[PDB]
Structures are given as C-alpha cells and as structure tokens.
C-alpha cells in the first residue's frame, strides 16, 4: 500500500527540520542540536544540512507554520537529500496542514523519521502514499550525552542502513526517561539507566500479523475528523501501535481515546495492538486496567496486545516503519517486523 | 435543517431514560429520582414514566448498552410519549452507537433533553434530522433540593411549553455547583448560591446570527471521526456552543480541541461561539487565554465569542435547541434565540 524508500549509506545527505517546536535554534539549546549532528556524521558517516527556517528559534517557528511546511517541501524536493530527520516534537504541527503539498512528497520518496508530535508529519507522508519511520529524533536520541545508546544505534542500522529483513525486535537491556536539562554544562553527565523487564502480553493467545499504523496516542487525536486521518482501508488487519507522552495523560483519557477507536470500528479491524513504555513508567499499571476494560466492553478479549515495548517517550528505542508487516507471537511474547524498512 | 418537535402541555406523558450512568435506580439514589419526577408532575403538570431498563441500577446499565439503546427506541416509538428526558449524564453512552435505530428517531419526532454525556444522544437525534435540546436532566436540575431554581423553570416553559419566539436569554442572578451528596438525609439542605456577573465578550465587535450546534466539548471528542459526527453542511454559518465538565479539563486540552476544530474547517465556518460557565469556575481565566490564543493562531480575532453563559455543568440553566437560529449582539453583550424551540 505504501512506498518504501531507498536505504541510506555513508556519504548521503540528511536534512534536519523543525516541524513542531523550534527549540533547536535557540541559543541555549544549539549546542545540543550540534551534538546530535556530530553523531550523524561520525557514527553513521552522513552529511547534514539544516533546512533554511529550521534553526530560526522557537518564536519564529511557532508564529510561522507556513515556513515550517516550506522547510519540509524543500527537503523533499531536494534530490540530494536521502533522509529527513525531525529535530524534536512539540504540540502544534497540525497547523501545517493547509500548506502541505502532498504530491511533492509522493513524487520524492525518501526516509522521514521522528516521533511524538511528529506523528502528524508521519500522517502527511502516509496520506501521500509514503512509508515513514516512527523513531529517534536529533535532540532526544542522536544527541544523547557522552554517547548514543548502542540499542538505538543498532536499530537505526538495521532499519535504515540494511535492506535485509528487520526481524525480531528484542527488548532493550536498560531504559531511561530521566529529565536532564539541555544546557551545555551538562554535556558530560550521563543519564541514569534502569534495568528493563521485557515485554508483557496483556491478552491474546494466537500469533497474528498485520501492517503497522498508529503513533503518539495524544497526537493522533489531533488528526481525527480531518482530512489527514488515514482512510478506512489503512486500518484493515492492522497492527496498531500507541505510546503516551511526557504529559502523562490520565488513565481515563486512554479509555476515552480507545473507546473512540471502537466507535470508529478500528479496534474491531485490528489484528493486534502494541504499547510503548510510558514515560517514567507513570501509570504503568493503571493503563493496563483501562486497556483491558475497553477490550472487555467491546468483546475483544482475544485481541493480542503487547505491552512495555521500547518505542515512544523513553530511551533507547527501535524504529517502526508505517505500513510494514509485523508480528505478535503470544506463545513466546515476542514482536517482529517481517520485512525490511527500506528498499 | 432539523425537524422541530411539537410543544409540551399539561397532561402529556414524559419518558425518563438512563443512556449513560445508571445510578437513578440505585437504592440509595432512587429517592432523588422520585424527587425530580415529583417536580415534573407538580410544577409542569406532566405524567412521568420510566422506560423498562432505565431504573435497573448502575451495574446492570453499565454492562448493557444495548438495553440502554432499547429504552431510547421504546420511548421514541411510543406515540403516547411526548418528551424524553435523561436522568443524568455519565461517560460511556458512545457505546450505544452499534445499537441505535436512526429511522426509529426520524419517524417519531419529539422532545429529547439532557446535557453532558447526553451530548452523544443529541448526536443521535441530530443525525436523524431531529432538533433536540441541550438542557436540564432529572437528577441534577428537576430534583434540586427544597425547590427548583425559578430560572430553570422559566426556560423550560419558554422553550418547551410555548411556540412563540424564545427571544433574549438573560443571565441568571446566582449560580452553584456545590457538592451535596444525593442521600435522602440531605434532602432538606439547600445548596449555597454564588453571585453571577453575567456574560463576557472575549472578542468581536459586530452582530452575528447562525444556527446552534455543539455541546460538552470533552464529549464531542468521543464522536470525532465517527459516523455520529455531523456532516459538513450543519457547520455552515453556525453558532458553536461549548461547555466543560466536572472533571475540569486542563486548559491545554481546550487548546488542542479547538485547534482540531480549526483543522476541520469548523471554526472558519462559524458565525460565533458561546461558552458555558465552567464547573466551580475552575480555570475560568485560563480558558479565556487558550481560546483567544487559538483564534490568533488561525486569524480569527474578529469572531464574536461570548463567555460565562448559564448552560453546562452549573445550575441554573437555560435550554439550547440544536439547529435553532441564535444571535450574539456585541454592542449589548447579549445572547438571544430568534425562533421558537417547539412547534
């Protein structure tokens, strides 16, 4: 259904963009952007170019959604650019909708990656028929202090640099979502890691497969009822993926949002669901309760649901290509992606 | 366009229903239902009948959305019933959607009234082409301890018993949303009133008129992207009305929801917006900031917005007929409904 982009290799040009929060250009955060760029260059051998408006600071970017859209279009129409990586999420990229040229995306298939509010930009790509990548961003992942997490590095290599099958996604040995201020004084401080416990199967007893769709569950709400919402066919036999933001949405909202997916008939079309580890593991237990209660309310207690995966608002993370075939193995408690991320 | 139902008069049979929370029939709450019914009988001269499943208790009713829908269909299909009034709101009446027969509503136009979660049931009527009424419910308004508020009595009479133009809606002199537990020992205790300071014009400077549509802004989210969402034609030249619930949605969420209304093209089609007083006037000032910020973001600073109206989760209330022509007068800071609610 979706176009798969070509793989990356050393020497390729990558564009960085600010479709949401324009913090990367602020003077006190700039060192952090530059640190992320350095890893793209040294660890992955890439060349990085910032789009013209992407570093003009949070105030300009907030007031100029059209200029943000232009940056995206510029990056897509530049044939030298082989991948596009968002600097960071935010909250208001839905304002870009009027100014997006979907054909400029459709005609220029390439890697587009990010998460959280960048979910909206992923829906741009999706609507244009392009498979994009729910994954690490410049400021939060590539710019990790002292060194990048080996796990994230591995998943970037497996998903964007190898054209082989991604295969089974093993859980990360450790995780963190500790708040460490992005001021240069902290650049040589490591974040504290916690031991990770691996995946949890909330319900389900069969092995299922289906194509990946979803994103940040708070942000997906922004697109409901708009032209940006994926057509009915995209939800058929899908594997839904959801993750929650740093705002720690209350469990009751997780319930309301999933009820709406049922009211849309989406939960009844799904082959399975996977959930990202909540930030700080806040509401870890309470979310399970609300998820299972909704499944019970709608007679969907046999639907495979996998919990505590390493995507979303904790580090490190793996990468989810929209539309790629994925598998939940309930007898084994595992999750796989049964194709390559790139051509 | 929506069908306007025939007016109410003394002797007419009115059905009560529990489309959301089923607490009305619970043993320690039943007295409160009976108190509200007594007012309907003695103040307005109506005959009140409970639908078959409406008083089976909160546990049964929670577990049986299909039974709730059948109560709704039973009331509509019975030609003896001239009006249907919700016992109370709640949170999950969206679960009724698979079970609603819309033609049963379309072929039996009559008064339907309630608020809050009952917004979803209003969307049932609205989709069936019937004008329903955002207004008082049995347990919260008609069952008010010691006596009903004169303001609420006046508006019910002006909206439901008279086929004349409703006219100008004057603000209520006092308001309340104090917690007083619905146990029978409390039945002789009045609730404390607070002073009400009238409407505030947030922005605008012209006189506009359009047809009413809206409801509880949290609950409307539940229907977005569903078959229940009103078609584009209903949003043209409208007066939007929004009110917030007892859970006090954070100001951020009001911003997100309004941004989505903008992404759908609804805010740009509206002639104006009115907002109900928040419960406990929680976030009174913060909501204003968020509302105005969203208008600024989308170049809509000339759109007349009226604030602090007496509909929503405080008592007393006036009644809003869906689809009826309303007016915001910006010089006088007033609100009026330019046609009859009934006949």
3-state secondary structure chain A: CCECCCCCCCCCEEEEECCCCCHHHCCCCHHHHHHHHHHHHHCCCCEEEECCCCCCCHHHHHHCHHHHHHHHHHHHHCCCEEEEEECCCCCCHHHHHHHCCHHHHHCCCCEEEECHHHHHHHHHHHHCCECCEECCCHHHHHCCCCCCCHHHHHHHHHHHHCCCCCEECCCCCEEECCCCCCCHHHCCCCCCCEECCCCEEEECCCEEEEEEEEEEHHHHHHHCCCCCCCCHHHHCCEEEEEECCCCCCCHHHHHHHHHHHHHCCCCCCCCEEEEECCHHHCCHHHHHHHHHHHHHHCCCCCCCEEEEECCCCCECCCCEECCCEEEEECCCCEEEECCCCCC
- Tokens matching residue A166: 């991604």
Q: Bridge partners of B240?
A: B213, B273
Alpha-carbon distance of B335 to B340, in angstroms, equals 15
Distance CA A158, CA A156 (A): 6
Report the C-alpha gap between A49 and A17 in whole angstroms.
9
Q: Measuring CA to CA, how many Å separate A322 from each of A115, A255, B30?
A: 12, 24, 52
Nearest to B263 among A91, A97, A297 (CB): A97
Q: If DSSP codes are grouped into helix, strand and coil, which group holds residue B24?
A: helix
Using the Cα atoms of residue B263, residue B266, residue B272 and residue B276 in order, give the sign of their dihedral.
Answer: negative
Say whether both A277 and A324 belong to one domain: yes
| CA A268 – CA A262 distance, rounded (Å) | 7
Distance CA A12, CA A45 (A): 8
- CA gap A109, A123 in Å, rounded: 14
User: Does one domain contain both A159 and A11?
Assistant: yes
Q: Rounded to an integer, what distance in angstroms lies between the CA atom of residue B303 and that of residue B295?
A: 8
**B191 and B159 in one domain?**
no
Q: Does the N-terminal peptide bond of residue B316 adopt cis geometry, omega within 30 degrees of 0?
A: yes
| Residues B170/B286, Cβ–Cβ less than 8 Å | no
Domain boundary among A164, A194, A210: A164
CA dihedral A309→A310→A313→A315, nearest 10 degrees, is 150
Does residue B99 contact residue B70 with C-beta atoms inside 8 Å?
Answer: yes
Tokens 């990360």 -> residue: A172
End-to-end CA distance of chain B: 15
Q: Which of A110, A135, A164 marks a domain boundary?
A: A164
Question: Checking DSSP bridges between strand B133-134 and strand B111-114, what pairing results, if any?
Answer: parallel
Q: Compute the distance between CA of residue A54 and CA of residue A183 in angstroms, rounded to an integer.
A: 20
Radius of gyration of chain B (CA): 19
Q: CB–CB of A263 and B223 under 8 A?
A: yes
Sign of the torsion formed by the C-alpha atoms of A293, A297, A302 and A303: negative
Within 8 A of B226 by CB-CB distance, chain A residues are 260, 263-264
**Structural determination approach:** X-ray
Give the resolution value in Å. Answer: 2.0
Assigned token pair, A83? 């991948």
List the structure tokens of A212.
């990946």
Judge whether B8 and B74 are in contact, CB under 8 Å: no
Half-sphere exposure of A220 (CA within 13 A, CB side): 19
**A272 and A159 belong to one structural domain:** no
Instruction: Residue A260: list chain B partners with CB under 8 A.
Output: 94, 221-226
Q: CA triplet A323, A328, A332: central angle to 5 degrees?
A: 155
Question: In the 8-state DSSP scheme, what is residue B117?
Answer: G
Do residue A145 and residue A178 come from a single domain?
Answer: no
What does each C-alpha distance from B56 to A149, B18, B99, B142, B214 come to in angstroms?
Answer: 57, 10, 19, 21, 31
CA-based nearest residue in chain B for residue A225: B225
C-alpha A247/C-alpha A90 separation (Å) is 11
Domain range for A281: 166-343
| Contacts of residue A27, Cβ cutoff 8 Å, sequence gap at least 6 | none
Say if residues A217 and A318 touch (Cβ distance below 8 Å).
no
Q: Does the beta-carbon distance from A297 to B95 stay under 8 Å?
A: yes
CA neighbours within 13 Å on the CB side: how many for A272? 29
Q: Do residues B192 and B302 share a domain? A: yes
Tell me, yes or no, whether A283 and A150 share the same domain: no
Chain A residues in contact with B221 by the CB 8 A cut-off are 221, 256, 260
A170 and A286 part of one domain? yes
Q: What are phi and psi of B315, to 5 degrees?
A: -110, 145
Alpha-carbon distance B218 to A52, whole Å? 39
Query: Strand B194-195 and strand B200-203: pairing?
Result: unpaired
CATH number assigned to the domain comprising residue B141: 3.40.50.10740
Q: Are A131 and A323 in contact (CB under 8 A)?
A: yes
CA distance B10 to B92: 33
Q: How many CB atoms lie within 10 A of CB A84?
A: 26
Contacting residues for B233 by C-beta, under 8 A, at least 6 apart: none
Cβ atoms of B296 and B289 within 8 Å: the answer is: no
Residue in A25, A30, A136 with CA at minimum distance from that of residue A83: A136
Determine the Cα angle at A299 with ends A297 and A304, to 5°: 110
Q: Do residues A10 and A141 share a domain? A: yes
CATH number of the domain to which B232 belongs: 3.50.30.60
Tokens of A307: 């919990």
Say if residue B223 is in the same domain as residue B326. Answer: yes
DSSP H or E segment with residue B245:
none
Contacts of B132 (CB under 8 A, 6+ apart): B111, B112, B113, B121, B122, B125, B126, B321, B322
Q: What is the largest CA-CA distance in chain B?
A: 54
Distance, CA of A83 to CA of A5 (rounded, Å): 9
Q: How many Cα atoms sit within 13 Å of A131 on the Cβ side? A: 24
Rounded to 5°, angle at Cα B58 from B52 and B63: 85
Element containing residue B261 per DSSP (H, E): helix B251-263
Q: What does DSSP say about strands A13-17 and A47-50: parallel, antiparallel, or unpaired?
A: parallel
Instruction: Say how many C-beta atoms besides its own lie within 10 A of residue B183's C-beta.
Output: 11
Measure A121 CA to nearest chain B CA, in Å: 14
- Spatial contact of A47 and A99, defined as CB atoms under 8 Å apart: no
Element (H, E) at B131: none
Within a 10 A sphere around the Cβ of A146, how many other Cβ atoms? 9
| E strand or H helix that includes residue B41 | helix B30-44
Quote the crossing angle between the two packed helices B284-297 and B251-263, to the nearest 10°: 30
Contact B260 A222 (CB under 8 A): yes
DSSP B77-104: H-TTEEEEEES---S-GGGGGGG--HHH
Q: How many whole angstroms separate alpha carbon B54 and alpha carbon B15?
A: 10
> Is the link from the previous residue into A316 a cis peptide, with omega within 30 of 0?
yes
Measured between alpha carbons, how far is B334 from B309 in angstroms, rounded to an integer?
Answer: 10
Using alpha carbons only, what angle is made at residue B313 by residues B120 and B302, rounded to the nearest 5 degrees? 85
Residue A197 CA, distance from chain mean position: 22
Indicate if A143 and A238 belong to the same structural domain.
no
DSSP-assigned beta bridge partners for residue A214: A241
Indicate left, alpha or beta for A167 from its phi (over 0: left) and psi (-120 to 50: alpha). Answer: left
Cα–Cα distance between A156 and A10 in angstroms, integer?
13
A210 with A325: CB under 8 angstroms? yes
Query: Which residue matches tokens 């003394």?
Result: B10
CA separation for the pair B294, A94 (Å, rounded)? 12
What is the C-alpha to C-alpha distance for residues A204 and A212, in angstroms, rounded to an integer?
18
**Is the CA virtual torsion A255, A284, A299, A215 positive or negative?**
positive
Measured CA to CA, the distance from residue B137 to residue B129 in angstroms comes to 22
End-to-end C-alpha distance for chain A, whole angstroms: 14
Task: Give the distance, in angstroms, between the CA of residue B205 and the centroid of all CA atoms in the same chain.
Answer: 27
Q: With contacts defined as CB-CB under 8 Å, which chain A residues touch B222?
A: 256, 259-260, 263
DSSP assigned state of B138: I
Residues of B whose CB is below 8 A from A226: 260, 263-264
**Cα–Cα–Cα angle for A38, A40, A42, rounded to 5 degrees:** 65
Which domain-ending residue is among A111, A146, A164?
A: A164
Structure tokens at B177: 């949303």
- In this structure, the answer to whether residues B136 and B271 fall within a common structural domain is no
User: Pick from A341, A307, A311: which is nearest to A116 by CA?
Assistant: A311
Task: Give chain B's domain count.
Answer: 2
Q: What length does chain A have?
A: 343
Strand order in the sheet with B325-329: B167-169, B334-337, B325-329, B208-216, B238-243, B272-276, B305-309, B200-203
Residues of A with CB under 8 A from a CB of B: 91-92, 94-95, 97, 221-226, 228-229, 247, 252, 256, 259-260, 263-264, 297-298
């Amino acid at each position: 259904m979706l176009i798969k982009p070509k793989r990356l290799q050393a020497g390729d040009i990558v564009a960085t963009v600010s479709p949401s929060w324009g913090g990367a250009g602020d003077s006190e955060i700039r060192w952090r952007y530059e640190q992320g760029v350095k890893r793209l260059e040294e660890v992955f051998g890439l060349t990085v170019v910032p789009m013209p408006n992407s570093l003009k600071g949070s105030e300009f970017i907030y007031n100029n959604p059209q200029a943000r859209a232009e940056d995206l279009m510029t990056a897509f129409q530049d044939t030298r650019v082989k991948a596009i990586i968002a600097n960071i999420g935010g909250q208001d990229s839905i304002r870009l909708l009027p100014y997006i040229d979907f054909n400029a995306i459709r005609e220029n298939p390439k890697i587009f990656m990010g998460y959280a509010d960048v979910t909206i930009s992923h829906l741009f790509c999706h609507k244009a028929g392009l498979s994009s990548f729910y994954g690490p961003a410049i400021l939060t992942d590539f710019a990790e202090n002292v060194e990048m997490d080996p796990y994230t590095v591995e998943m970037v290599n497996r998903t964007l640099f190898s054209n082989e099958m991604i295969g089974e996604i093993q859980p990360a040995p450790e995780w963190t979502s500790e708040r460490l201020e992005w001021i240069e004084i902290n650049k040589d401080t490591r974040r504290t890691m916690q031991q990770n416990n691996g995946y949890e199967l909330l319900q389900g007893s069969t092995t299922v497969q289906g194509r990946l769709i979803g994103g940040c569950i708070e942000v997906l709400e922004f697109a409901k009822g708009t032209e940006l919402w994926p057509e009915k066919k995209h939800w058929e036999d899908s594997i839904l993926f959801f993750e929650t933001s740093e705002d720690h949405p209350e469990p009751s909202y997780i319930k309301y949002w999933l009820r709406n997916y049922a009211a849309q008939g989406i939960l009844q079309k799904a082959k399975g669901i996977i959930f990202g580890k909540p930030k700080d593991e806040m509401y870890y237990e309470e979310y399970k309760h609300e998820i299972l209660q909704v499944m019970k309310e709608h007679n969907l207690e046999d639907l495979p649901i996998l919990y505590n995966l390493n995507f979303g608002h904790t580090e490190p993370k793996f990468i989810l290509p929209y539309g790629s075939m994925a598998e939940i193995d309930c007898e084994n408690g595992s999750f796989s992606i049964l194709e390559s991320g790139v051509e």
